[PDB]
Amino acid sequence: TNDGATILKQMQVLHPAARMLVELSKAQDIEAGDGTTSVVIIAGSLLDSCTK
Amino acid sequence: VVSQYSSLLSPMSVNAVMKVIDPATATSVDLRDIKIVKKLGGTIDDCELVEGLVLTQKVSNSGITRVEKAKIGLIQFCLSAPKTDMDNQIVVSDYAQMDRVLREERAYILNLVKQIKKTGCNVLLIQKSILRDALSDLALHFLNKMKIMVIKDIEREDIEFICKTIGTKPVAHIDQFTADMLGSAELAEEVNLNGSGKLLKITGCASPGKTVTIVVRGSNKLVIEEAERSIHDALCVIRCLVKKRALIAGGGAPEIELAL
Amino acid sequence: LDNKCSVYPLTFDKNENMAAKKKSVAMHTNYLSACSFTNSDMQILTASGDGTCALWDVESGQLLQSFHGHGADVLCLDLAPSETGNTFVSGGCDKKAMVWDMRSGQCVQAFETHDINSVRYYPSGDAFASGRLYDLRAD
Amino acid sequence: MMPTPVILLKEGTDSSQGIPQLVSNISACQVIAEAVRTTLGPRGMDKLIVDGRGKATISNDGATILKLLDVVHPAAKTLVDIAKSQDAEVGDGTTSVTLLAAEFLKQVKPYVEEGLHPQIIIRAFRTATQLAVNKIKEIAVTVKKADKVEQRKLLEKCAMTALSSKLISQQKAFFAKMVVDAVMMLDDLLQLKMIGIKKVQGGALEDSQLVAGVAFKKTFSYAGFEMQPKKYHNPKIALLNVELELKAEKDNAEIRVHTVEDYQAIVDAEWNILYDKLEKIHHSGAKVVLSKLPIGDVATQYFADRDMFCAGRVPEEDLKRTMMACGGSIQTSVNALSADVLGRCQVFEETQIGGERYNFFTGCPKAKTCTFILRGGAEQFMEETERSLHDAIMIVRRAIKNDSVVAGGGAIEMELSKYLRDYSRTIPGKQQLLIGAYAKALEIIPRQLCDNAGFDATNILNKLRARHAQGGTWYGVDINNEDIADNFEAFVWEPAMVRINALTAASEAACLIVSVDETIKNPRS
Amino acid sequence: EGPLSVFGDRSTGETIRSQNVMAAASIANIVKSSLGPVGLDKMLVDDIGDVTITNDGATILKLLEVEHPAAKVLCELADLQDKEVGDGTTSVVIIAAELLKNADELVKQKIHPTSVISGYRLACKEAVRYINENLIVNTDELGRDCLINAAKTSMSSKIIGINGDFFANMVVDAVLAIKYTDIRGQPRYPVNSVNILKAHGRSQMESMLISGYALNCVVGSQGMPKRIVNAKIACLDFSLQKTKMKLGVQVVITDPEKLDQIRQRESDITKERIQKILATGANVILTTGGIDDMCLKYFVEAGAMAVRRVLKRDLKRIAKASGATILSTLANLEGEETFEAAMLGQAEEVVQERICDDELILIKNTKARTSASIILRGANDFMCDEMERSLHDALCVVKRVLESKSVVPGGGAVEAALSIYLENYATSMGSREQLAIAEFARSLLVIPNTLAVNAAQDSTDLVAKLRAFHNEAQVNPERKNLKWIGLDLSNGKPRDNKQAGVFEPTIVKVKSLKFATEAAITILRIDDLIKLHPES
Amino acid sequence: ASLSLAPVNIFKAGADEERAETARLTSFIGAIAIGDLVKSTLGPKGMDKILLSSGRDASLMVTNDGATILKNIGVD
Ligand SMILES: Nc1ncnc2c1ncn2[C@@H]1O[C@H](COP(=O)(O)OP(=O)(O)O)[C@@H](O)[C@H]1O
Numbered sequence A: 001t002n003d004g005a006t007i008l009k010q011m012q013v014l015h016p017a018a019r020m021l022v023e024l025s026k027a028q029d030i031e032a033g034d035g036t037t038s039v040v041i042i043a044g045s046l047l048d049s050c051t052k
Numbered sequence B: 001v002v003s004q005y006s007s008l009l010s011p012m013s014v015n016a017v018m019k020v021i022d023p024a025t026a027t028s029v030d031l032r033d034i035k036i037v038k039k040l041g042g043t044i045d046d047c048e049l050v051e052g053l054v055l056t057q058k059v060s061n062s063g064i065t066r067v068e069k070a071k072i073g074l075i076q077f078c079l080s081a082p083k084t085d086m087d088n089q090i091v092v093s094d095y096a097q098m099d100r101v102l103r104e105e106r107a108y109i110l111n112l113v114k115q116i117k118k119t120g121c122n123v124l125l126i127q128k129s130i131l132r133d134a135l136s137d138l139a140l141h142f143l144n145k146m147k148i149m150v151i152k153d154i155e156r157e158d159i160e161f162i163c164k165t166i167g168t169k170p171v172a173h174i175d176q177f178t179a180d181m182l183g184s185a186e187l188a189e190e191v192n193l194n195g196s197g198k199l200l201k202i203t204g205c206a207s208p209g210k211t212v213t214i215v216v217r218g219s220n221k222l223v224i225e226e227a228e229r230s231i232h233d234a235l236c237v238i239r240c241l242v243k244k245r246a247l248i249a250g251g252g253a254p255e256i257e258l259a260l
Numbered sequence C: 001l002d003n004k005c006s007v008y009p010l011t012f013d014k015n016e017n018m019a020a021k022k023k024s025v026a027m028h029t030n031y032l033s034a035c036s037f038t039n040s041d042m043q044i045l046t047a048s049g050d051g052t053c054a055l056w057d058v059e060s061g062q063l064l065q066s067f068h069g070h071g072a073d074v075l076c077l078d079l080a081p082s083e084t085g086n087t088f089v090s091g092g093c094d095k096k097a098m099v100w101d102m103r104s105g106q107c108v109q110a111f112e113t114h115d116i117n118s119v120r121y122y123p124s125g126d127a128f129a130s131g132r133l134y135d136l137r138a139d
Numbered sequence D: 001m002m003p004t005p006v007i008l009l010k011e012g013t014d015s016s017q018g019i020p021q022l023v024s025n026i027s028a029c030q031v032i033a034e035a036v037r038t039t040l041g042p043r044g045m046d047k048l049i050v051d052g053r054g055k056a057t058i059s060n061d062g063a064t065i066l067k068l069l070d071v072v073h074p075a076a077k078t079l080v081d082i083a084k085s086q087d088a089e090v091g092d093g094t095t096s097v098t099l100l101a102a103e104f105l106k107q108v109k110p111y112v113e114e115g116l117h118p119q120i121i122i123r124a125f126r127t128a129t130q131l132a133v134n135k136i137k138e139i140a141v142t143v144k145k146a147d148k149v150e151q152r153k154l155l156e157k158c159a160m161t162a163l164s165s166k167l168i169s170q171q172k173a174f175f176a177k178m179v180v181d182a183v184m185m186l187d188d189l190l191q192l193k194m195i196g197i198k199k200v201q202g203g204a205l206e207d208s209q210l211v212a213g214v215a216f217k218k219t220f221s222y223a224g225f226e227m228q229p230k231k232y233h234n235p236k237i238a239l240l241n242v243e244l245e246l247k248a249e250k251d252n253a254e255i256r257v258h259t260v261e262d263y264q265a266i267v268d269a270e271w272n273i274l275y276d277k278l279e280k281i282h283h284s285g286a287k288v289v290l291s292k293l294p295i296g297d298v299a300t301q302y303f304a305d306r307d308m309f310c311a312g313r314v315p316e317e318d319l320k321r322t323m324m325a326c327g328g329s330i331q332t333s334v335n336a337l338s339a340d341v342l343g344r345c346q347v348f349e350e351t352q353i354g355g356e357r358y359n360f361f362t363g364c365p366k367a368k369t370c371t372f373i374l375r376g377g378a379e380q381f382m383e384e385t386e387r388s389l390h391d392a393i394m395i396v397r398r399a400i401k402n403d404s405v406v407a408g409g410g411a412i413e414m415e416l417s418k419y420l421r422d423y424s425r426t427i428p429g430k431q432q433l434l435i436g437a438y439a440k441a442l443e444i445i446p447r448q449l450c451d452n453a454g455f456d457a458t459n460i461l462n463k464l465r466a467r468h469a470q471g472g473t474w475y476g477v478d479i480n481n482e483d484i485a486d487n488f489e490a491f492v493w494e495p496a497m498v499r500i501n502a503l504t505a506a507s508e509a510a511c512l513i514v515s516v517d518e519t520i521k522n523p524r525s
Numbered sequence E: 001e002g003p004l005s006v007f008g009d010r011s012t013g014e015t016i017r018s019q020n021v022m023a024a025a026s027i028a029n030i031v032k033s034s035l036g037p038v039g040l041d042k043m044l045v046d047d048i049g050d051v052t053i054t055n056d057g058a059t060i061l062k063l064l065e066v067e068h069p070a071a072k073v074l075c076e077l078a079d080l081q082d083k084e085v086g087d088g089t090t091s092v093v094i095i096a097a098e099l100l101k102n103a104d105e106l107v108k109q110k111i112h113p114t115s116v117i118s119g120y121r122l123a124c125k126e127a128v129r130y131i132n133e134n135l136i137v138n139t140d141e142l143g144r145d146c147l148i149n150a151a152k153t154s155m156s157s158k159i160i161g162i163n164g165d166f167f168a169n170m171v172v173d174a175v176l177a178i179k180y181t182d183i184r185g186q187p188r189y190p191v192n193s194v195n196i197l198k199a200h201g202r203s204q205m206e207s208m209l210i211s212g213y214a215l216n217c218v219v220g221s222q223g224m225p226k227r228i229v230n231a232k233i234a235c236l237d238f239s240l241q242k243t244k245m246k247l248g249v250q251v252v253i254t255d256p257e258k259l260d261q262i263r264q265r266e267s268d269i270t271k272e273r274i275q276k277i278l279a280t281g282a283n284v285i286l287t288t289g290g291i292d293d294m295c296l297k298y299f300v301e302a303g304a305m306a307v308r309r310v311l312k313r314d315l316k317r318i319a320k321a322s323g324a325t326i327l328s329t330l331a332n333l334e335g336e337e338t339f340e341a342a343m344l345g346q347a348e349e350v351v352q353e354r355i356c357d358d359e360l361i362l363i364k365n366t367k368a369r370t371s372a373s374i375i376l377r378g379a380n381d382f383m384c385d386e387m388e389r390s391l392h393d394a395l396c397v398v399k400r401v402l403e404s405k406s407v408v409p410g411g412g413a414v415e416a417a418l419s420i421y422l423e424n425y426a427t428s429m430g431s432r433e434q435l436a437i438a439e440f441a442r443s444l445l446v447i448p449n450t451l452a453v454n455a456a457q458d459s460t461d462l463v464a465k466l467r468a469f470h471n472e473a474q475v476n477p478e479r480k481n482l483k484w485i486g487l488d489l490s491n492g493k494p495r496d497n498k499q500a501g502v503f504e505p506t507i508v509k510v511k512s513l514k515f516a517t518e519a520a521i522t523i524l525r526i527d528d529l530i531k532l533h534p535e536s
Numbered sequence F: 001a002s003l004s005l006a007p008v009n010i011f012k013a014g015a016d017e018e019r020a021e022t023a024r025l026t027s028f029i030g031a032i033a034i035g036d037l038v039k040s041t042l043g044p045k046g047m048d049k050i051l052l053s054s055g056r057d058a059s060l061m062v063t064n065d066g067a068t069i070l071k072n073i074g075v076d
């Protein structure tokens, strides 16, 4: 698969933050249906900035 | 993965979304009105948009596989020996009662089939039944002798979709079974996918109400699943256009503009 | 090795003698603690590891009522004396045995003096085995 | 396979024969090559290997990486062997040999798979290798001017090219100048042992220095050593192999006396022997005394009282370097300490070098040796610096032997590939395919350079091929400019023998691997 | 094991791309030795001593235990080709693995997989277009000899190869026998309606083509006759047993006098049914259910053959062939229980034939429709099993030729022609896809390469000579007859395969290219593998 | 991020570390335990302790001295 929601669901992520990213991807799939990978990438970049 | 086939799938997805909504009034799209059927074999080039109904069930009759000017009837009761909701037993005390029971059961089944046939129905869909035989073998024999295609084991969850598609009102008691509750259709035939299975397609309906079917085919199962996911993504994007009538450029342009 | 049962009667190969309608709901998955068939074959009671008793209808296939209130998972459950609105007990790991009634969907009675795993109604229905004996008419 | 009652060979013997085993050998060679691929060129990276003991090593050198890998595949060990051979004969190009050999094998793999007789492949490789070596000898640029400045510039450019792939590449000009200066002081054999290399932890790379003389660490001074002066402005050095200690005259010597007067005489005789040795050393006129053997506390205090410097247990290599720098002779006896056997340097000094004490012998005008003092932040830093300097030193030595150069950066490989393709277009056609495969395999070097640098290798290769076919011999990969350039005017120079040996060894290894049809492994004992 | 924190392994980049190519190549190397007339069969021991000697590509991969997901893609690819074509199963696996191997070489050269995929898709489209325009031969110009040559070509590499002169005749005759027309007048050939029976014994030459139907069944009782001349066949879908009331019916006796009469009806009801069936002149009674001992006596006394437990698919073919009608019950539309003469099939003979210490029914020369059955004779069960698989390919091959009337020359003629054309056509399509299309052309040469290798001949020279002839045909307009040149594996030299009679159905090559390309594209699309560890 | 709470592990087996709050907690706990042990043996009305050695000698010691009490205890 290339779908972000499917990729995140299939791989069993264990860290809680990754679980909430999976839930975010599900929500983006529900509301829009595309941009499922982009939203996860955006969230990751945002938190990366939050580090600094 | 379906990018070389986009010339086939993009118009297909747009047609599928437009066929299930009213463009002048629709504010959202119910994607459950678009049914996707995955059949192994062939190539994604063989993906087809069916304007009618596609059923994976097998025709019980042998020798009747194509009906023109069909009159489909949907049945939610059982064509078998009479059986009440309460506990029922038939007590036999004489030898004559045995063949009387046999004859009366045959007459009951024959009367049911005759009442069904009198309405002009020629394609019969029988809902899946438990605790009671939906289709008795004797009933199947009588229906076959009267030139009626019989399809059984119809799932309960699909009744709404079938009724919305082919315009058939479900019948739960034989008394209410009349001609006005039949769904007229142009053609109901069972096609064969070149030795990869069979499909029952009912194409051409007098009342094609806001429902379309997509048949997805491919060489192996993995690409079929990915094609289904991709087609779903395309349908969701057209749904987004329906919900919010606004278009933006792509290729990172919104992100660059947003950052600047 | 561990299984040695993958070829179980799952096949159910017969000559289609009206017994093939086994339903086999298995929608909730998890663990089917008790798949007891109701005396009236209309309904199925199932208990899962979450501690909720589930009532299903064989014909429609829909979950009628999920009975929750047990402290732990319900290891065992029984049925009514004959039908009597299916006032069924439910014994679990929480050392407690209680009776439920779908006419209200509530725990009508409860008992705690013992995990119960061998509930069985008395033929009269005024009591039930608690493998003890709890009296319905005296609680 | 019917089980014979008595089997022929020992049980557990494994035998694989035919096409599949040769294909597996080619795959193993590919696996070995890809472990050193990224360490090629100015954009190459380093590999870190941790042994069982947990002592890690970091290197950009192909031979070092391959040796540190515990290769057990019989066909793969040939690549390690040819890497060692290239390191021994030339010293640079230990990555190119492996890449070329594996690329030859990969190119001929499809022909092997379709039943081509391996003898034909071997003959084709040998023909192509002979032609390529002759072409390298013919087109290599040599300057027949015998100009000292020109020769020095050639050596410096070659050293810079050899060094512009390591962690010392930022100071490559500085290090290349130091290497050329170091090598040019060796007399006629250019022995490596005459170039000392000392690693002193702490300090920047630019703090590294080359001493025109000899330097070594302070060696376990005894009591009274700190009272000796630590600087002399014209010392005479007494190189000795003598133990200046109070000890038994011989291990099997036994003294038998029967009078207290004789007892006192024996004690005084031992003391007088030691003092006679010390007095001869002092009257030799020397001021700095170095011994291959221990020097005791008594001798240390004796030399301190005379304002002299002493150092014992000096390593033999350091003593030989001191001989070569100062010009004396290591004397095992002090009975004839004539002025000719005494070393001489302008300045001797003991100084602090990054938390350690070193003895410096500088100002040697007739010096035939040198010592590198390498500074770095870690042990592996200085080790990799030493390896890089060794590569540069070997290149400079070979260039001293003969000054024939070919432009690097894939230029020579591209020219050879063009020549071999043009040749292969004019032969019957069974050998044509294999020689064309050889020419195509020659293109691995610029392709790997572009891949490591992060370019688009295909476009650069197309431009290089077009430039070579159209005209131009020394056009290769230009890493900084994202493009191609005339690598001869860019001073990317390497000696011709580097590529000659690389091609020869790669061809020999490929032929050896191809010629094998069966592998048999006996059970271990 | 890092910041991802997933309970499983992960492989990314060239690590997984090369591993995927490994698995695809491993499957091809299994079946690569069983391609072409000089191919050899394989033994497949099934861990309990069961032996399966076969040359079919699909059968080999069905029985193999494959674990890599990429390998399972090719194993399922062979199965798909078998279902939808029936031949070319070994070729499609070889081509797909070669396509993936050459595609990965481009990817290692920093060519994006999308460019390679786009190039492969273009080449597959043009290869199909080129085949349909320059390499097809209309079968109407060859007559019956085309069908035999097409059948003979398929039988090469099979255990019925050398004896294909005799075996091809049955396959052509058997397929033509079961031919029938449908709506819109399309002649369709329901191959696999030709029942195939295996029985060891005599040589292969004694294989018999039955002009009728063969049943792997025997008569129920020894008292019945074992031969009927003018058979009136009655086909029934219900058992002939003692009557037993259903679940909803109970027998409760209050007056003991009624007990005996009730028990009489339990057996007279079936007797009355049998008497009605026999009264119309039926000689052969075939039923899918059992027959009780007391029911068999009625057929014994009437001198009629009765066979029980007949397979449902076998009965349907017999009913269709003999003109009979399947009856699940005796019940007319008047509520009575009757049997009519119009529901009786007919045949010219029914025989209890004996075949190698075993017996079977031969329904010979059915009327109103012509059927066919084949009995295969071999040394043992292992060899008889393989002939059935080999014959199935031949039946499928003839079916395709009769449906689509176009054939293509065999022996690598198509791949050699395509490789020349595609590599020339690649120069006129884009700049980055040129390499991808060229590699598609190169990958097709694996078929003629493998044929020459299996014959222990110089594959390099034969392919070069074969390619030289095909190159001349494309560049010289007056040498177009060289398109038919393929490989003569017996002598090891190019040969005009159209004249030599080495034909294949066009659909075999066309469907092979489409399926192999999609399978190769699917694997080429992957660059990351996450393998979650099992929960147990 | 911290050495212990990092996705990659930087320590040999059996080697650990304690950050600000945890290190302060352990230090304060140890110091308070030592003070509570040694006290109650303080002043004119203090009591004595018994130091029953668990070793092979099993030496018995009764003392009011704080230094000797703190010396003969296994402190980690
Ligand atoms: N042909 C194209 N050219 C440039 N950008 C594209 C193109 N197609 C898609 N994109 C961009 O790729 C991004 C990812 O899209 P896609 O992978 O299809 O779905 P998702 O956004 O769920 O990952 C989108 O933001 C889109 O703007």
Ligand SMILES: Nc1ncnc2c1ncn2[C@@H]1O[C@H](COP(=O)(O)OP(=O)(O)O)[C@@H](O)[C@H]1O
Pocket: D039, D040, D041, D042, D044, D062, D092, D093, D094, D095, D096, D161, D162, D163, D164, D165, D407, D408, D409, D410, D445, D449, D477, D478, D479, D492
């Ligand atoms: N400045 C440069 N520009 C282009 N190529 C270079 C440059 N310096 C070195 N190279 C190339 O890098 C290749 C590898 O050199 P290096 O990694 O130092 O040693 P080895 O040959 O052992 O890998 C040489 O073939 C050389 O041509």
Ligand SMILES: Nc1ncnc2c1ncn2[C@@H]1O[C@H](COP(=O)(O)OP(=O)(O)O)[C@@H](O)[C@H]1O
Pocket: E034, E035, E036, E037, E055, E056, E057, E086, E087, E088, E089, E090, E091, E092, E153, E154, E156, E157, E410, E411, E412, E451, E486, E487, E488, E489, E502, E504
């Ligand atoms: N008589 C012949 N001469 C030359 N080539 C042949 C001959 N018969 C068959 N071939 C070639 O050998 C190949 C054998 O294919 P085969 O392995 O039987 O098909 P599958 O792939 O279904 O197993 C075919 O592609 C055909 O082109």
Ligand SMILES: [Mg+2]
Pocket: A034, A035, A036, B233
């Ligand atoms: Mg998208």
Ligand SMILES: [Mg+2]
Pocket: D092, D093, D162, D163, D165, D391
């Ligand atoms: Mg180098």
Ligand SMILES: [Mg+2]
Pocket: E087, E088, E089, E154, E393
């Ligand atoms: Mg074949």
